[PDB]
Amino acid sequence: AMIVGLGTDIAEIERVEKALARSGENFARRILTDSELEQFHASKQQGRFLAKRFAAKEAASKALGTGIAQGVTFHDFTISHDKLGKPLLILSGQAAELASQLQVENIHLSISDERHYAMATVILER
Amino acid sequence: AMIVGLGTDIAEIERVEKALARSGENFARRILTDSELEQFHASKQQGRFLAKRFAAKEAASKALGTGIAQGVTFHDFTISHDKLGKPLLILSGQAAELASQLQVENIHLSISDERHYAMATVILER
Amino acid sequence: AMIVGLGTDIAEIERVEKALARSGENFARRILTDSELEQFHASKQQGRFLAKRFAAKEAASKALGTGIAQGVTFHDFTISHDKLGKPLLILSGQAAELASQLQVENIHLSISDERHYAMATVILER
Ligand SMILES: CC(C)(COP(=O)(O)OP(=O)(O)OC[C@H]1O[C@@H](n2cnc3c(N)ncnc32)[C@H](O)[C@@H]1OP(=O)(O)O)[C@@H](O)C(=O)NCCC(=O)NCCS
Ligand SMILES: CC(C)(COP(=O)(O)OP(=O)(O)OC[C@H]1O[C@@H](n2cnc3c(N)ncnc32)[C@H](O)[C@@H]1OP(=O)(O)O)[C@@H](O)C(=O)NCCC(=O)NCCS
Ligand SMILES: CC(C)(COP(=O)(O)OP(=O)(O)OC[C@H]1O[C@@H](n2cnc3c(N)ncnc32)[C@H](O)[C@@H]1OP(=O)(O)O)[C@@H](O)C(=O)NCCC(=O)NCCS
Ligand SMILES: [Ca+2]
Ligand SMILES: [Ca+2]
Ligand SMILES: [Ca+2]
Ligand SMILES: [Ca+2]
Ligand SMILES: [Ca+2]
Ligand SMILES: [Ca+2]
Ligand SMILES: [Cl-]
Ligand SMILES: [Cl-]
């Protein structure tokens, strides 16, 4: 019925690429869950892949009203896709607990990227 | 009621300008309906005009859940404005058929551009 | 509860910084209410602070459906924050009068910035 939260985020792709060039998997694993890493490792544009997931998760954390804090971690969010490529967001851990407290029934996520920037928006509704 | 789709897109204006300098009307006509072409032709900043429409339409195609695919074309989306300048989105063709299947009753669109980027967000609600 | 409006906006931070270097308070006071100026004055990154507020207010004005026109001014939008850092939008002046006529009961705002750009999205719900 009503919107419980709204979140948006923009990420500079070159910054994510630089971080991967320096710290690689140590950096990717802080952001991605084990299930997401398979898809990540398969990509030939890993910085772009990670930039999008980073924007999506930050946008989700803001829609929750906590950001990546108060027990909410990047691993509480998992990004997947439907059969036509639409991105989907699934919550776990503290994010799932807060969503339940807020009575969230539907989650909407959209992602976009151009050469230099990735962005995402998330809406939680009850 | 509830949100049935969310879409967002960011477009680099310079790439649109380069495409117009090379292919002009042939490129513009792939994105714009005949009705929209009249407004486009009267514009004195065509690359900027077209980048905004491009972002709006891709955002709308993501809100429908298909992208520009599965029979959904750029011509299935028409952008107009109300008397105060608010952008309005009207669907046709396969986009309209899918929206009808999604029970879409209200469509919201917002657009913004700065010197180098144009972006848009679309929300479909039932 | 349906969506009354949606607004989005992107702002180039260096343009805001340049404006401040030239016009300072004359510029800042056009965008910010006296109450918001207190927080602004305490910031050590005033250009970035102001770029975010500028984006939030422009987005809010688009969600209302008027833009910054028709008696609606930048001062009709006040950005505050909750204890966890979530941004909150409160309307006044003509914006509040119009929102009341539209039966707006819930307002949602999200803001994000990266090195060069600030962006925001606003949704008004009845
Ligand atoms: C908000 C967060 C997710 C992102 O921070 P950031 O990249 O500086 O944020 P962005 O510029 O995209 O967003 C800043 C805006 O987010 C919004 N925000 C902050 N806290 C929020 C909250 N609890 N809920 C919703 N929105 C929030 C605010 O509008 C803020 O700007 P403002 O304070 O001027 O209004 C933050 O919780 C965070 O970065 N936490 C730690 C993340 C981390 O571990 N980082 C290491 C890198 S892997
Ligand atoms: C999705 C589409 C609309 C835009 O493609 P794009 O510009 O590469 O996409 P963007 O970079 O803006 O966004 C990519 C994201 O869109 C989202 N997306 C993809 N398919 C989607 C769908 N069916 N529904 C909703 N969102 C979708 C995804 O999150 C994707 O990123 P991810 O796969 O890493 O999660 C695509 O269907 C398209 O444009 N197809 C035809 C190609 C075309 O005509 N191009 C223009 C030529 S002039
Ligand atoms: C909408 C406004 C807030 C910003 O316009 P802008 O600088 O062109 O900003 P953007 O590029 O971000 O937005 C343009 C889009 O906003 C949208 N828009 C315009 N009027 C709108 C309205 N009444 N309601 C909702 N959206 C609107 C349109 O989609 C427009 O693009 P289009 O005409 O190509 O479709 C406008 O009312 C304005 O500039 N007011 C004056 C603000 C001011 O005082 N500026 C001085 C600089 S401090
Ligand atoms: Ca961020
Ligand atoms: Ca892209
Ligand atoms: Ca795109
Ligand atoms: Ca502009
Ligand atoms: Ca603007
Ligand atoms: Ca930032
Ligand atoms: Cl234009
Ligand atoms: Cl700041």
Residues in the 5 Å CB sphere of ion ligand 11:
C 48-49
* Interstrand relation of A3-12 and A117-125 (parallel, antiparallel or unpaired): antiparallel
> Which experimental method was this entry solved with?
X-ray
* Residue A54 vs residues A120, B112, C109: alpha-carbon distances, Å: 9, 23, 20
CATH number for the domain formed by residue range(s) C1-126: 3.90.470.20
B98: helix, strand or coil: helix
Least CA distance to C113: which residue of chain A? A10
Planar angle of CA B86, B123, C62, nearest 5 degrees: 30
C-alpha distance from residue A36 to each of A11, A97, B59 (Å): 19, 21, 25
How many beta-carbon pairs under 8 angstroms link A with B?
A: 54
**CB-based contact C11:C47 (threshold 8 Å):** no
User: Which residue in the block uniquely carries the two structure tokens 């009203």?
Assistant: A65
Q: Which two tokens stand for residue A45?
A: 């544009």
Which ranges constitute the DSSP H helices of B1-45? 13-31, 34-42
- The answer to whether the Cβ–Cβ distance between B8 and A120 falls below 8 Å is yes
Given a contact cutoff of 8 angstroms between Cβ atoms, the answer to whether A76 and A97 are in contact is no
Interface of C with B in 42-61 (CB under 8 A): 58-59
Known binder of ligand: residue C58? yes
Among the partner-chain residues C2, C8, C62, the one whose CB lies closest to the CB of B125 is: C2
Backbone torsions φ then ψ of A84, nearest 5 degrees: -105, 5
Q: DSSP alpha helices (H): ranges in C46-125?
A: 46-64, 93-101
Residue C46's φ and ψ, nearest 5 degrees, are -55, -40
Nearest CA in chain B to A107: B3
What's the gap in Å between C116 CA and the centre of ligand 9?
9
Ligand nearest to the CA of C46: 11
> Which is nearest to C12 in space by CA: C121, C87, C115, C122?
C115
State how far Cα A77 lies from the chain centre.
Answer: 6
Give the C-alpha distances (Å, rounded to integers) separating A34 from A13, A37, A78: 22, 5, 10
3-state secondary structure of C79: strand
Query: Six-digit token pair at B12?
Result: 């680099």
Q: Does A85 touch chain B (CB under 8 A)?
A: yes
The answer to whether the Cβ–Cβ distance between A6 and C121 falls below 8 Å is yes
Reduced to 3 states, what is the DSSP secondary structure of residue A90?
strand
DSSP code per residue over B63-88 = HHTS-S-TT--GGGEEEEE-TTS-EE
Q: For residue C17, give the DSSP letter.
A: H
Distance from chain centroid for Cα A92: 12
| Domain segments of chain A as ranges | 1-126
Q: Spell out which residues of chain B touch residue C1, defining contact as CB-CB under 8 Å.
A: 1
Indicate the length of chain A as a whole number.
Answer: 126
**C109 at the B interface (CB within 8 A)?**
no
Q: Which two tokens stand for residue B5?
A: 């789709």
Instruction: Return the CA Rg of chain C.
Output: 14
Sequence-distant (≥ 6) Cβ neighbours of residue C36 within 8 angstroms:
C53, C78, C79
In this structure, what are the phi and psi dihedrals at residue C67, rounded to the nearest 5 degrees?
A: 75, -165
Cβ–Cβ gap A8/C106 under 8 Å: no
Of B49, B70, B52, B48, the closest CA to residue B61 belongs to B70
DSSP 8-state class, residue A115? S
Of residues B51, B101, B98, B115, the one with CA closest to residue B79: B51
- CA C55, CA B110: separation in Å to the nearest integer? 13
